Amino acid sequence: NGFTVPGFITRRSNAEINVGDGQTMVISGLVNPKTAKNVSKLPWLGDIPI
Amino acid sequence: LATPSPFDMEKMVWLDVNILEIRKSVLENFGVDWSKQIPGPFAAFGKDFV
């Protein structure tokens, strides 16, 4: 109504581990490429080069 | 008189996950679309005998 309710962008990790004294441990990592192309054209004129 | 350890050091496991997805689509709409229902002929008669 006027009571704005927000959404969030989150990065959360909940891990159980065991390590030695002073060692560095990675508990999460991500690589995430994304791509999308859309074309509209006329039937024969669209394919003329340039 | 022996005592246990506070906990047991367990083996650590690294998990690597890959998710690959590809989508392709084509859409075409071509031709001439005519009318399929048109009015037909009409006839009417009317008379006053008396």
TrEMBL record, chain A:
Transmembrane segments: none annotated. Belongs to the bacterial secretin family. This is Type II and III secretion system protein. The chain holds residues 353 to 402 of 502 of the full protein.
